Structure 1
């Protein structure tokens, strides 16, 4: 077995959160919000003199893709869900449609909020992010998400071409079996690193979807086949070292005319529509901090390879991964 592999797997067991289809609690919290949307739309549409439109819900985000992590103490669960409203996009304003959902959920938990990309509802210990889409069958065959808030300049308010199930299919399908298992472990490892080392400034933290898209482009399996038994052993430390090095190699110094300097930027295109850079909202200074911490993680992953003492290998990794990374006693 590869050095530190046991402690990586132990760390993975401690940080992993069971996906929607294996997590009753998450299914219930989701369905509660979906139910409240149905009840709430009735009242919103009583004032407009017709039945509320129906919607088809579908699972989104990490809890759909089986890349979910437990939040740190005092953090929140992030339940991502899509609702496809039975509406023609050309007949309605994206913000109008999100307002229906917001007003439907006004008196639910700690309230609700129109965001650029979703309506978020807040509960004690979690938020539900409802991505709101128009019916492709009434919108010319395209699935469009409702983008914009009231404060949006009307250029940032639109029905944008979207492919959440294509993205989810791409993450599911890149690899199979135990290869796909290591891919998913390495995404969870980076998400716990993110939560541990980007807690001072939440807005500077690399988005989950960015780390997931980065793994889609750049993750390579690391495993070894014993030449006698043909018995396959995974090397998560090496897989993470190669993946972190490849992310670092993809940073580009980017001129900023305001500050009259460059910042190192990592561009990560979504592999599906709308093919946007999911890191575009991260500032140059946030990107430089992201790069330095990624370099520090890369250095720790190399240190963990060379150490005489398993204690010293694990301790070097725990400094980047936090309190769930096992450190065997010297």
Structure 2
């Protein structure tokens, strides 16, 4: 019979997983260090304006909130995502200015902050902290809005955009339960490691993380077998990946670009909560074309790894796409 690869996938998962905030004191302390720095820095920033400093409530975001986090490859960075809800009315402030408050509060913290379009990012050895900045729903008419725009942006691109990070997190947590949900999370992690191994450490692959998470929300399906007599359950991560990758490939659509006078294959993945935006929208057509090609190569490898006699060969085919922490037994 063909060599199975489930034990190797579970070993691979053990190597790449990074514990979520609730189980990771190091991440909680690094998060809280950035949060304490912003409180102190705001004291100083606003004593300088004759105004009382604003208060904020933080909340966990991203993969370390959703338990979909992976360890970076050597040289890569961890990504601590957090939301802060300032006690301010959105109609009374420009979003970029509010993010300036936060950046200035984190001037002399670590490697200094940086105002990015959707967050303030502070850099420290081996990780960065992505602070998404929101206005208070109570003071802003009932809705939760994130500060969009950077110092580069014109008036068209400075806005307070409706956002539902807790509804998104709830949907990821609630789609499945128990060991079904564990396999869902494993497969998200496997594809994040594939991202880090086969796409560059620049931001062209920056939307892959959230994109693959939202893709899995729409399209992942469990693969397990239940013995009709013993009721014993075994999971098949290789097959779950094969079905999911094939479904992603099925949803690419050839999309004409009038500027370039050609089509590019594009995968649109809507966020399942507000603002329902295509989380892959920033990827260029040429990057989409490369993404599709690499997903197809991954799919071909997943199929090859089903049909090898030797476990070494099945695992080698997988490690060509998942990298050198995918275990490959000797022949």
Q: How would you bin the TM-score normalised by the shorter chain?
A: over 0.9
On the 8 A contact 1:112/1:121 being kept in 2, the answer is yes
Q: What is the CA distance between 1:202 and its match in structure 2?
A: 4.0
1:103, distance to aligned residue in structure 2 (A) = 0.5
Q: Point out 4+ residue stretches in structure 1 off by more than 3 angstroms.
A: none
Aligned counterpart, 2:60: 59
Q: Separation in 1 of the partners of 2:199 and 2:157?
A: 28
Question: Contact conserved, 2:305 with 2:317, CA < 8 A, in 1?
Answer: yes
Alignment of 1:317-328 (within 5 A): 317-328=318-329
Structure 1 residue 74: Cα displacement: 0.3
In the alignment, the residues of structure 2 paired with residue 38 and residue 239 of structure 1 have an alpha-carbon distance, to the nearest angstrom, of 45
* Alpha-carbon contact 2:82-2:130 (below 8 Å) kept: yes
CA distance in 2 between counterparts of 1:202 and 1:147 reads 18
State the 1:205 CA deviation: 5.0
1:107-145: CA deviation from partner (whole Å, max 9, x where unpaired): 111111111100000101110000000000111110000
Q: CA 1:309/1:185 → structure 2, altered by over 3 Å: closer, same or farther?
A: same
How many residues get paired? 330
Distance of 2:120 and 2:277 partners within structure 1:
20
Whether the 8 Å CA contact 2:304–2:314 is kept in 1: the answer is yes
Q: Which string of whole-angstrom CA distances, capped at 9 and with x for unpartnered residues, describes residues 275-294 of structure 1?
A: 00111110000000000000
Alpha carbons of structure 1 residues 147 and 202: separation in structure 2 relative to 1, 3 Å: closer
Q: Tell me, in whole angstroms, the C-alpha distance in 1 between the residues paired with 2:208 and 2:240.
A: 21
| Cα distance in 2, alignment partners of residues 200 and 81 from structure 1 | 22
TM-score with structure 1 setting the length: 0.98
User: What's the offset of the Cα at 1:206?
Assistant: 4.3
Cα 1:102–1:57, aligned 2, differ >3 Å: closer, same or farther? same
Which residues of structure 2 form unaligned runs of 5+? none
Cα deviation for residue 173 of structure 1 reads: 0.3
Report the more deviating stretch, 66-75 or 219-228. 219-228
How much does 1:309 deviate? 1.0
Secondary structure in structure 2 of the residue aligned to 1:306: coil
Deviation (angstroms), 1:153: 1.9
Give the Å deviation of 1:155: 1.1
Question: Which whole-Å CA distance do the structure 2 matches of 1:81 and 1:205 have between them?
Answer: 17
Q: Deviations over 1:60-105 (max 9, x none)?
A: 0000000000000000010000000011111111111100001000
Task: Give SS of 1:7's match.
Answer: helix
Alignment of 1:234-249 (within 5 A): 234-249=235-250
Within a 5 Å distance, the mapping from 1:219-238 to structure 2 comes to: 219-238=220-239
Task: Identify unmatched segments of 5+ residues in structure 1.
Answer: none
Question: 1:79 aligns to what SS in structure 2?
Answer: strand
Deviation at 1:53?
A: 1.1
C-alpha separation in 1, matches of 2:304 and 2:25: 40
Tell me the TM-score normalized by structure 2.
Answer: 0.98
The 10-residue stretch of structure 1 (89-98 or 189-198) with the greater mean CA deviation from structure 2: 89-98
- What's the CA shift for 1:326? 0.7
Q: Write the distance in 2 (CA, Å) between the matches of 1:87 and 1:266.
A: 37
Shift of 1:106: 0.9
User: CA deviation digits over 1:32-56, x for unaligned, max 9?
Assistant: 0000000001111102223211100
- Conserved 8 A contact 1:198-1:205: no
Deviation at 1:227, TM superposition (A): 2.1
Greater shift, 198-207 or 78-87, is seen at 198-207
Q: Which aligned pairs between 1:155-170 and structure 2 lie closer than 5 A?
A: 155-170=156-171
CA contact (8 A) 2:3 2:311 kept: no
Q: 1:139 to 1:206 in 2, by over 3 A?
A: closer
Distance 2:152 2:329 in 1: 53
Q: Partner of 1:211 in structure 2?
A: 212
